[PDB]
Amino acid sequence: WKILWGLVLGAVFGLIAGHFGYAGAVKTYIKPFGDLFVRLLKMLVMPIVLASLVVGAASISPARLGRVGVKIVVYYLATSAMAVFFGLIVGRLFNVGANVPPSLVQTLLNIVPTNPFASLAKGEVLPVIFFAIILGIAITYLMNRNEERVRKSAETLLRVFDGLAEAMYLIVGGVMQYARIGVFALIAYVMAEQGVRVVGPLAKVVGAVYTGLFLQIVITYFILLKVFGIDPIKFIRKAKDAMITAFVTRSSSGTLPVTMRVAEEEMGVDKGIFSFTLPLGATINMDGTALYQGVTVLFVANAIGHPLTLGQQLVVVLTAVLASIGTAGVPGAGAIMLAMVLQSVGLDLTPGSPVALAYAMILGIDAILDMGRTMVNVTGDLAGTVIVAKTEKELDESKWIS
Amino acid sequence: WKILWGLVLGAVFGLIAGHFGYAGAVKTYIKPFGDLFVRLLKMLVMPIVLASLVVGAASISPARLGRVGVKIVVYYLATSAMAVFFGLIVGRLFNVGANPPSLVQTLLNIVPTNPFASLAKGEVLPVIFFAIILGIAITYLMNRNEERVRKSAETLLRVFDGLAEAMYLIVGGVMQYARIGVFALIAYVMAEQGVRVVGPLAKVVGAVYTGLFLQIVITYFILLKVFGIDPIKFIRKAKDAMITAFVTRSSSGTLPVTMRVAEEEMGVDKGIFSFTLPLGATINMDGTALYQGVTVLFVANAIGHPLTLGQQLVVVLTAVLASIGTAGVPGAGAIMLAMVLQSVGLDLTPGSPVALAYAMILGIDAILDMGRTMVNVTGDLAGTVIVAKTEKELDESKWIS
Amino acid sequence: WKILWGLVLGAVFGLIAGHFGYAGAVKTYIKPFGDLFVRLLKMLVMPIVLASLVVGAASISPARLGRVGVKIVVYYLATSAMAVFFGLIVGRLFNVGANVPPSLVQTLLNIVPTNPFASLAKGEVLPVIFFAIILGIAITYLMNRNEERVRKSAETLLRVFDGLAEAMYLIVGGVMQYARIGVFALIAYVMAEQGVRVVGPLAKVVGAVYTGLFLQIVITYFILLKVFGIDPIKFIRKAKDAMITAFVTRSSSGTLPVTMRVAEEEMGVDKGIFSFTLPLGATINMDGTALYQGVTVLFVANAIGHPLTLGQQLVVVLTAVLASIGTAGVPGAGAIMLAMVLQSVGLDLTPGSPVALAYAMILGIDAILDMGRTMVNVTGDLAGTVIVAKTEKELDESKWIS
Ligand SMILES: N[C@@H](CC(=O)O)C(=O)O
Ligand SMILES: N[C@@H](CC(=O)O)C(=O)O
Ligand SMILES: N[C@@H](CC(=O)O)C(=O)O
């Protein structure tokens, strides 16, 4: 566990530097090695998505793809709704807040791109997913054609994407060799920057939020995994490279390459499931963001002395799940969509309003909460993949046996 | 003809909704299914162009490509010039109007500065130039004496060949949804502009649509019979692209289905239809030229300054010249119509009522965009069969009952 | 030498037209045939880079790639530093000037792209180089795998890039058939436009700068080439297509396709060296830009009567080499980065001081100096490739024997 050692050592180094006022030295000396690690992984996000979906979709019939697609969507929505429920529980238990819209139809239509090459250039995950899935379905239909020229043309096209997919998986393994320094550098800069703001009432928010994410892993991804027969301890131990990487990169879409490599080289999941459930889940399944939004909504409301009612806590659950899909896999994306959650309950943010000062207080520790959010936003993607794969008999039983 | 049934049923539904003031309900309930249909076809425009040109150009020698290229350009210019002539005839008969980019730089823009940027920016002409020479280079490498170069070129062509067949397969799947997309698209357009066609604007719509109907049956029915191609079979076979262009209102948008129809219903070799269709989708728009001819007289007659006989000839050259300028996007004919009006001297100013007549046309621009795109792709199909017949690339079995 | 004949004939035609005031006719009649030539070559820059690096890197083991990479960087920095030294010598000898910042760490991090498809769309050479090199390294590792499916998938992926590379090399040969008209048109317009501004003190700058570039070729690329055994006369004669093309296109990145074709079809250099040293050198190795900056810094200083001291001439050398990497392979890129060189020595540019007046005077003949700059910015890339190839035994001895 050398990678995990860097996270603990870097946090101590960041706290020591932050307490001694050495944040400036770390920002211009250590961080540049953390930024290189983020850029290396963010580079492989697009090639590993276009290649994996085409090979993954072409390896299974469209009938099984529909069953797998519907199955994971129910899990994604149920876990996201459960995550918001946990957020209200931990927020009320800790009593946070003591002192002191995009079109839904247009968002669905945006799944279908107007230019597949522009979506790759613009770094859009969902439009690429739609184009690559139907490309894989079209490829596997051409391989069943009676003509020999069409069959060989489709095989050559798939081999290019198959060779591209294996190339990216190989590069990720090389990149993670540098992760022992990238993880150490990333956590050191974040700890040094925000090692002081967590002093008073903001500390209760961090404690309440992090308690919810910890409970979410061991009550939602430990009970459901045991129901379907997957060992929870093995799942957490195997998926520690993506959990640590998401805990430093703070971008679920950013830590997509390593999540794909871990899900297939450590869990034995077929390419027809993990290649589809991971990128789609990286854009629509973020339980940590939903749980964080639940706590902060109560924190903002309790700061201005207008706590949510029992009925008001139910409408905010639906919006939090709805806003969860809206958030992208980029750092600091949960605070932007948190405004829509606050406006849903009626707490509009006005330039000098009290609800616009509690919002600024959250943004002070937004990065320290972004770390916990991304840690579980990819764990749910992995946990759902094993659950769906177990029901589809695509799990490799040898990989889960000591 | 289930697809054609949706167009007629949707028009009735749109007229009923528009007359009862239910345009708001259609815009937020029905249009979203039409927008999905447009996005599905617009997605396949770029992959179906890059893959088809490479395979199409590599399947024939460059000598035949030059003969085919020159042959269709003469047809494209002759039909466009004829289309403007029809527009003046129908405009004068109906008595409508009762109540600049560098040319050299445009030609230089055909050669891209970055092939990947052209694909990302959705440019058809720069992609055409790069893909044609890529296909020519590929077919030259396959004739090399070295074995490694020959296999490398074959693998590169098979990737584009597999990509081309994949897009053609996806189009067939998309057109299964066209029974709902066409119905939704025509319903929203009819509901939105079912009231503005009431008075003098109705005469413009009648005069313009008469010209496009006459253009199909006098230009694409006489020339097709001269070269031996049956006109009735051509119209019946190319009804999927005609209907799709009549709802999408974007010739570049309805390029995928036009390619699939031209090869799975007409038996045209990939070396002709893959080249003549995208190039024609950017430079051959007879409906736009015919529409511009009628509206120029309508604008002039509205302000009481009719064009003279000499003034009607200079406006013909500009209309053909402005026809190439228009892109395959909705509402692109009105933007370039300003250049046609300024050519004859009718500059648009906020003070003069010249801009007032221009604004009146924009009110029914979408209802005229539907007829324009309907023939802008028919001419691309009609020219392809004419060129293919002269090149003996037409499949005679596909044109025999 | 028909191509070289057009350059001489076009210069005479441009001078005659410029002297008679016929620059307007040439700009709207002749230049458009030169612009077509530039667009044709600029189109092939990206496909010839992505395809060549992948095939070049996969053809050799990563151990040899590191040795070649380090070897050429030392040559690139040594020649660039030598070029600035020559600029001060010719500038002081001619006595020019008689009358009258981007982050370094961020620039290095920008080598690793965040989206490989966006880098291709945005026309970035260095980010594409990094992605294509590791893609080639990953491909050659997959071909050594024990599995048969992975081996065939990697071979198919390489054959696509191999077929793409040979296609671009074939297109360049076709484009250079038109170069007899493109070179004539390009040089005619430039000569006609700036055939009058070279009259007085600006003529001394052109003479001093062009003397330095001529001396650089015959003292730096003629002594070092003879040391390693490569004939200097054969190198210049063979690499005359790229030298002339760079002398009209005025963009080293623009004249990358022909430089690649000349380096492999006339010098017998393996694809693992020239495909890597040329595009990297087209962005970081510009000796002509460095030599031009050295002369103009003294010219600007001497114009305002504040000549550089002996110590001040050494700090300006380091910045000129540092600013040399900053310049891109586009026309007029040396004047933009020349401001940083002037500010390094203390000569900040202000509208009031005549420092900007001397800078504006240089911009008047910037294009006539851009021609000489690009002529040697690609010669150094070619000269370094043969030197590195000779040490790696990848040079074809048959191509260098009459
Ligand atoms: N940065 C988080 C989203 C958030 O800000 O909540 C992620 O990528 O998962
Ligand atoms: N939208 C039309 C052009 C026009 O507006 O006339 C087309 O794509 O063909
Ligand atoms: N245009 C030159 C750079 C410069 O302006 O000095 C080149 O591409 O090499």
JSON list of N, CA and C in Angstrom, two decimals, chain B residues 290-339:
[
{"chain": "B", "resi": 290, "resn": "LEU", "atom": "N", "xyz": [-34.08, 29.53, -56.59]},
{"chain": "B", "resi": 290, "resn": "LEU", "atom": "CA", "xyz": [-35.43, 29.85, -57.06]},
{"chain": "B", "resi": 290, "resn": "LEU", "atom": "C", "xyz": [-36.17, 30.72, -56.05]},
{"chain": "B", "resi": 291, "resn": "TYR", "atom": "N", "xyz": [-36.00, 30.42, -54.75]},
{"chain": "B", "resi": 291, "resn": "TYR", "atom": "CA", "xyz": [-36.63, 31.24, -53.72]},
{"chain": "B", "resi": 291, "resn": "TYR", "atom": "C", "xyz": [-36.09, 32.66, -53.73]},
{"chain": "B", "resi": 292, "resn": "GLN", "atom": "N", "xyz": [-34.78, 32.81, -53.93]},
{"chain": "B", "resi": 292, "resn": "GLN", "atom": "CA", "xyz": [-34.18, 34.14, -53.95]},
{"chain": "B", "resi": 292, "resn": "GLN", "atom": "C", "xyz": [-34.69, 34.95, -55.14]},
{"chain": "B", "resi": 293, "resn": "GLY", "atom": "N", "xyz": [-34.94, 34.29, -56.27]},
{"chain": "B", "resi": 293, "resn": "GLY", "atom": "CA", "xyz": [-35.44, 35.01, -57.43]},
{"chain": "B", "resi": 293, "resn": "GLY", "atom": "C", "xyz": [-36.82, 35.60, -57.21]},
{"chain": "B", "resi": 294, "resn": "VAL", "atom": "N", "xyz": [-37.71, 34.84, -56.55]},
{"chain": "B", "resi": 294, "resn": "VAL", "atom": "CA", "xyz": [-39.06, 35.33, -56.30]},
{"chain": "B", "resi": 294, "resn": "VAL", "atom": "C", "xyz": [-39.04, 36.46, -55.27]},
{"chain": "B", "resi": 295, "resn": "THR", "atom": "N", "xyz": [-38.26, 36.29, -54.20]},
{"chain": "B", "resi": 295, "resn": "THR", "atom": "CA", "xyz": [-38.26, 37.28, -53.12]},
{"chain": "B", "resi": 295, "resn": "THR", "atom": "C", "xyz": [-37.62, 38.59, -53.54]},
{"chain": "B", "resi": 296, "resn": "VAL", "atom": "N", "xyz": [-36.65, 38.56, -54.46]},
{"chain": "B", "resi": 296, "resn": "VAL", "atom": "CA", "xyz": [-36.06, 39.80, -54.96]},
{"chain": "B", "resi": 296, "resn": "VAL", "atom": "C", "xyz": [-37.11, 40.63, -55.68]},
{"chain": "B", "resi": 297, "resn": "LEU", "atom": "N", "xyz": [-37.93, 39.99, -56.52]},
{"chain": "B", "resi": 297, "resn": "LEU", "atom": "CA", "xyz": [-39.02, 40.71, -57.16]},
{"chain": "B", "resi": 297, "resn": "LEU", "atom": "C", "xyz": [-40.08, 41.13, -56.15]},
{"chain": "B", "resi": 298, "resn": "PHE", "atom": "N", "xyz": [-40.34, 40.29, -55.15]},
{"chain": "B", "resi": 298, "resn": "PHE", "atom": "CA", "xyz": [-41.32, 40.63, -54.13]},
{"chain": "B", "resi": 298, "resn": "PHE", "atom": "C", "xyz": [-40.88, 41.85, -53.33]},
{"chain": "B", "resi": 299, "resn": "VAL", "atom": "N", "xyz": [-39.60, 41.90, -52.95]},
{"chain": "B", "resi": 299, "resn": "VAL", "atom": "CA", "xyz": [-39.08, 43.06, -52.22]},
{"chain": "B", "resi": 299, "resn": "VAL", "atom": "C", "xyz": [-39.13, 44.30, -53.10]},
{"chain": "B", "resi": 300, "resn": "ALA", "atom": "N", "xyz": [-38.72, 44.17, -54.37]},
{"chain": "B", "resi": 300, "resn": "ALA", "atom": "CA", "xyz": [-38.72, 45.31, -55.28]},
{"chain": "B", "resi": 300, "resn": "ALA", "atom": "C", "xyz": [-40.14, 45.80, -55.56]},
{"chain": "B", "resi": 301, "resn": "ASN", "atom": "N", "xyz": [-41.07, 44.88, -55.78]},
{"chain": "B", "resi": 301, "resn": "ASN", "atom": "CA", "xyz": [-42.44, 45.28, -56.10]},
{"chain": "B", "resi": 301, "resn": "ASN", "atom": "C", "xyz": [-43.15, 45.86, -54.88]},
{"chain": "B", "resi": 302, "resn": "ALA", "atom": "N", "xyz": [-42.74, 45.46, -53.67]},
{"chain": "B", "resi": 302, "resn": "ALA", "atom": "CA", "xyz": [-43.34, 46.02, -52.46]},
{"chain": "B", "resi": 302, "resn": "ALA", "atom": "C", "xyz": [-43.06, 47.51, -52.34]},
{"chain": "B", "resi": 303, "resn": "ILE", "atom": "N", "xyz": [-41.83, 47.93, -52.67]},
{"chain": "B", "resi": 303, "resn": "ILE", "atom": "CA", "xyz": [-41.47, 49.34, -52.61]},
{"chain": "B", "resi": 303, "resn": "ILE", "atom": "C", "xyz": [-41.71, 50.06, -53.93]},
{"chain": "B", "resi": 304, "resn": "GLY", "atom": "N", "xyz": [-42.37, 49.42, -54.89]},
{"chain": "B", "resi": 304, "resn": "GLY", "atom": "CA", "xyz": [-42.68, 50.06, -56.15]},
{"chain": "B", "resi": 304, "resn": "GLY", "atom": "C", "xyz": [-41.49, 50.38, -57.03]},
{"chain": "B", "resi": 305, "resn": "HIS", "atom": "N", "xyz": [-40.47, 49.52, -57.02]},
{"chain": "B", "resi": 305, "resn": "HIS", "atom": "CA", "xyz": [-39.29, 49.67, -57.88]},
{"chain": "B", "resi": 305, "resn": "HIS", "atom": "C", "xyz": [-39.00, 48.34, -58.56]},
{"chain": "B", "resi": 306, "resn": "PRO", "atom": "N", "xyz": [-39.83, 47.93, -59.52]},
{"chain": "B", "resi": 306, "resn": "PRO", "atom": "CA", "xyz": [-39.65, 46.62, -60.14]},
{"chain": "B", "resi": 306, "resn": "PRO", "atom": "C", "xyz": [-38.34, 46.53, -60.92]},
{"chain": "B", "resi": 307, "resn": "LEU", "atom": "N", "xyz": [-37.79, 45.32, -60.97]},
{"chain": "B", "resi": 307, "resn": "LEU", "atom": "CA", "xyz": [-36.57, 45.08, -61.73]},
{"chain": "B", "resi": 307, "resn": "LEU", "atom": "C", "xyz": [-36.84, 45.20, -63.23]},
{"chain": "B", "resi": 308, "resn": "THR", "atom": "N", "xyz": [-35.86, 45.74, -63.95]},
{"chain": "B", "resi": 308, "resn": "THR", "atom": "CA", "xyz": [-35.95, 45.83, -65.40]},
{"chain": "B", "resi": 308, "resn": "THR", "atom": "C", "xyz": [-35.50, 44.51, -66.03]},
{"chain": "B", "resi": 309, "resn": "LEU", "atom": "N", "xyz": [-35.61, 44.43, -67.36]},
{"chain": "B", "resi": 309, "resn": "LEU", "atom": "CA", "xyz": [-35.16, 43.23, -68.06]},
{"chain": "B", "resi": 309, "resn": "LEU", "atom": "C", "xyz": [-33.66, 43.04, -67.90]},
{"chain": "B", "resi": 310, "resn": "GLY", "atom": "N", "xyz": [-32.89, 44.12, -68.02]},
{"chain": "B", "resi": 310, "resn": "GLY", "atom": "CA", "xyz": [-31.46, 44.02, -67.77]},
{"chain": "B", "resi": 310, "resn": "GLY", "atom": "C", "xyz": [-31.14, 43.74, -66.31]},
{"chain": "B", "resi": 311, "resn": "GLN", "atom": "N", "xyz": [-31.90, 44.35, -65.40]},
{"chain": "B", "resi": 311, "resn": "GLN", "atom": "CA", "xyz": [-31.69, 44.12, -63.97]},
{"chain": "B", "resi": 311, "resn": "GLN", "atom": "C", "xyz": [-32.06, 42.70, -63.56]},
{"chain": "B", "resi": 312, "resn": "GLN", "atom": "N", "xyz": [-32.91, 42.02, -64.32]},
{"chain": "B", "resi": 312, "resn": "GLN", "atom": "CA", "xyz": [-33.26, 40.64, -64.01]},
{"chain": "B", "resi": 312, "resn": "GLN", "atom": "C", "xyz": [-32.19, 39.65, -64.45]},
{"chain": "B", "resi": 313, "resn": "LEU", "atom": "N", "xyz": [-31.26, 40.08, -65.30]},
{"chain": "B", "resi": 313, "resn": "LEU", "atom": "CA", "xyz": [-30.17, 39.21, -65.73]},
{"chain": "B", "resi": 313, "resn": "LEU", "atom": "C", "xyz": [-28.98, 39.25, -64.78]},
{"chain": "B", "resi": 314, "resn": "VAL", "atom": "N", "xyz": [-28.64, 40.43, -64.26]},
{"chain": "B", "resi": 314, "resn": "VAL", "atom": "CA", "xyz": [-27.55, 40.53, -63.29]},
{"chain": "B", "resi": 314, "resn": "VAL", "atom": "C", "xyz": [-27.92, 39.83, -61.99]},
{"chain": "B", "resi": 315, "resn": "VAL", "atom": "N", "xyz": [-29.20, 39.91, -61.59]},
{"chain": "B", "resi": 315, "resn": "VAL", "atom": "CA", "xyz": [-29.65, 39.22, -60.39]},
{"chain": "B", "resi": 315, "resn": "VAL", "atom": "C", "xyz": [-29.61, 37.71, -60.55]},
{"chain": "B", "resi": 316, "resn": "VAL", "atom": "N", "xyz": [-29.62, 37.21, -61.79]},
{"chain": "B", "resi": 316, "resn": "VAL", "atom": "CA", "xyz": [-29.51, 35.77, -62.02]},
{"chain": "B", "resi": 316, "resn": "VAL", "atom": "C", "xyz": [-28.10, 35.29, -61.70]},
{"chain": "B", "resi": 317, "resn": "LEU", "atom": "N", "xyz": [-27.09, 36.02, -62.16]},
{"chain": "B", "resi": 317, "resn": "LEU", "atom": "CA", "xyz": [-25.70, 35.63, -61.90]},
{"chain": "B", "resi": 317, "resn": "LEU", "atom": "C", "xyz": [-25.39, 35.67, -60.41]},
{"chain": "B", "resi": 318, "resn": "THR", "atom": "N", "xyz": [-25.86, 36.71, -59.72]},
{"chain": "B", "resi": 318, "resn": "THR", "atom": "CA", "xyz": [-25.62, 36.80, -58.28]},
{"chain": "B", "resi": 318, "resn": "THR", "atom": "C", "xyz": [-26.36, 35.70, -57.52]},
{"chain": "B", "resi": 319, "resn": "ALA", "atom": "N", "xyz": [-27.59, 35.37, -57.94]},
{"chain": "B", "resi": 319, "resn": "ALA", "atom": "CA", "xyz": [-28.34, 34.32, -57.26]},
{"chain": "B", "resi": 319, "resn": "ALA", "atom": "C", "xyz": [-27.62, 32.98, -57.35]},
{"chain": "B", "resi": 320, "resn": "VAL", "atom": "N", "xyz": [-27.08, 32.66, -58.53]},
{"chain": "B", "resi": 320, "resn": "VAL", "atom": "CA", "xyz": [-26.26, 31.45, -58.66]},
{"chain": "B", "resi": 320, "resn": "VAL", "atom": "C", "xyz": [-24.99, 31.58, -57.83]},
{"chain": "B", "resi": 321, "resn": "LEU", "atom": "N", "xyz": [-24.35, 32.75, -57.87]},
{"chain": "B", "resi": 321, "resn": "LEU", "atom": "CA", "xyz": [-23.15, 32.97, -57.06]},
{"chain": "B", "resi": 321, "resn": "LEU", "atom": "C", "xyz": [-23.47, 32.90, -55.57]},
{"chain": "B", "resi": 322, "resn": "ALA", "atom": "N", "xyz": [-24.60, 33.48, -55.16]},
{"chain": "B", "resi": 322, "resn": "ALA", "atom": "CA", "xyz": [-24.99, 33.42, -53.76]},
{"chain": "B", "resi": 322, "resn": "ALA", "atom": "C", "xyz": [-25.50, 32.03, -53.38]},
{"chain": "B", "resi": 323, "resn": "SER", "atom": "N", "xyz": [-25.91, 31.23, -54.36]},
{"chain": "B", "resi": 323, "resn": "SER", "atom": "CA", "xyz": [-26.39, 29.88, -54.06]},
{"chain": "B", "resi": 323, "resn": "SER", "atom": "C", "xyz": [-25.28, 29.03, -53.46]},
{"chain": "B", "resi": 324, "resn": "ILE", "atom": "N", "xyz": [-24.06, 29.13, -54.00]},
{"chain": "B", "resi": 324, "resn": "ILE", "atom": "CA", "xyz": [-22.93, 28.41, -53.42]},
{"chain": "B", "resi": 324, "resn": "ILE", "atom": "C", "xyz": [-22.63, 28.92, -52.01]},
{"chain": "B", "resi": 325, "resn": "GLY", "atom": "N", "xyz": [-22.81, 30.22, -51.77]},
{"chain": "B", "resi": 325, "resn": "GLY", "atom": "CA", "xyz": [-22.50, 30.77, -50.46]},
{"chain": "B", "resi": 325, "resn": "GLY", "atom": "C", "xyz": [-23.37, 30.21, -49.35]},
{"chain": "B", "resi": 326, "resn": "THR", "atom": "N", "xyz": [-24.63, 29.90, -49.66]},
{"chain": "B", "resi": 326, "resn": "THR", "atom": "CA", "xyz": [-25.54, 29.37, -48.65]},
{"chain": "B", "resi": 326, "resn": "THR", "atom": "C", "xyz": [-25.07, 28.00, -48.17]},
{"chain": "B", "resi": 327, "resn": "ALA", "atom": "N", "xyz": [-25.17, 27.78, -46.86]},
{"chain": "B", "resi": 327, "resn": "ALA", "atom": "CA", "xyz": [-24.79, 26.52, -46.26]},
{"chain": "B", "resi": 327, "resn": "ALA", "atom": "C", "xyz": [-26.01, 25.63, -46.05]},
{"chain": "B", "resi": 328, "resn": "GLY", "atom": "N", "xyz": [-25.75, 24.37, -45.73]},
{"chain": "B", "resi": 328, "resn": "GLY", "atom": "CA", "xyz": [-26.82, 23.41, -45.50]},
{"chain": "B", "resi": 328, "resn": "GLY", "atom": "C", "xyz": [-27.40, 23.48, -44.11]},
{"chain": "B", "resi": 329, "resn": "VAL", "atom": "N", "xyz": [-27.76, 24.68, -43.66]},
{"chain": "B", "resi": 329, "resn": "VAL", "atom": "CA", "xyz": [-28.35, 24.87, -42.34]},
{"chain": "B", "resi": 329, "resn": "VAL", "atom": "C", "xyz": [-29.68, 25.60, -42.51]},
{"chain": "B", "resi": 330, "resn": "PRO", "atom": "N", "xyz": [-30.61, 25.42, -41.57]},
{"chain": "B", "resi": 330, "resn": "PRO", "atom": "CA", "xyz": [-31.90, 26.11, -41.67]},
{"chain": "B", "resi": 330, "resn": "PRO", "atom": "C", "xyz": [-31.72, 27.62, -41.64]},
{"chain": "B", "resi": 331, "resn": "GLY", "atom": "N", "xyz": [-32.53, 28.30, -42.46]},
{"chain": "B", "resi": 331, "resn": "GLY", "atom": "CA", "xyz": [-32.51, 29.75, -42.49]},
{"chain": "B", "resi": 331, "resn": "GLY", "atom": "C", "xyz": [-31.28, 30.36, -43.12]},
{"chain": "B", "resi": 332, "resn": "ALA", "atom": "N", "xyz": [-30.52, 29.58, -43.89]},
{"chain": "B", "resi": 332, "resn": "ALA", "atom": "CA", "xyz": [-29.31, 30.09, -44.54]},
{"chain": "B", "resi": 332, "resn": "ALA", "atom": "C", "xyz": [-29.60, 30.85, -45.83]},
{"chain": "B", "resi": 333, "resn": "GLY", "atom": "N", "xyz": [-30.79, 30.69, -46.41]},
{"chain": "B", "resi": 333, "resn": "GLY", "atom": "CA", "xyz": [-31.11, 31.39, -47.64]},
{"chain": "B", "resi": 333, "resn": "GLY", "atom": "C", "xyz": [-31.44, 32.85, -47.44]},
{"chain": "B", "resi": 334, "resn": "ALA", "atom": "N", "xyz": [-32.02, 33.20, -46.29]},
{"chain": "B", "resi": 334, "resn": "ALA", "atom": "CA", "xyz": [-32.34, 34.59, -46.02]},
{"chain": "B", "resi": 334, "resn": "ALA", "atom": "C", "xyz": [-31.09, 35.42, -45.75]},
{"chain": "B", "resi": 335, "resn": "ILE", "atom": "N", "xyz": [-30.07, 34.82, -45.13]},
{"chain": "B", "resi": 335, "resn": "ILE", "atom": "CA", "xyz": [-28.85, 35.56, -44.83]},
{"chain": "B", "resi": 335, "resn": "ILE", "atom": "C", "xyz": [-28.14, 35.97, -46.12]},
{"chain": "B", "resi": 336, "resn": "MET", "atom": "N", "xyz": [-28.02, 35.03, -47.06]},
{"chain": "B", "resi": 336, "resn": "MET", "atom": "CA", "xyz": [-27.38, 35.33, -48.34]},
{"chain": "B", "resi": 336, "resn": "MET", "atom": "C", "xyz": [-28.31, 36.06, -49.30]},
{"chain": "B", "resi": 337, "resn": "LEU", "atom": "N", "xyz": [-29.61, 36.13, -49.00]},
{"chain": "B", "resi": 337, "resn": "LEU", "atom": "CA", "xyz": [-30.52, 36.91, -49.83]},
{"chain": "B", "resi": 337, "resn": "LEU", "atom": "C", "xyz": [-30.20, 38.40, -49.79]},
{"chain": "B", "resi": 338, "resn": "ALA", "atom": "N", "xyz": [-29.57, 38.87, -48.71]},
{"chain": "B", "resi": 338, "resn": "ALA", "atom": "CA", "xyz": [-29.18, 40.28, -48.64]},
{"chain": "B", "resi": 338, "resn": "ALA", "atom": "C", "xyz": [-28.19, 40.63, -49.73]},
{"chain": "B", "resi": 339, "resn": "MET", "atom": "N", "xyz": [-27.23, 39.74, -50.00]},
{"chain": "B", "resi": 339, "resn": "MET", "atom": "CA", "xyz": [-26.26, 39.99, -51.06]},
{"chain": "B", "resi": 339, "resn": "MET", "atom": "C", "xyz": [-26.94, 40.06, -52.43]}
]
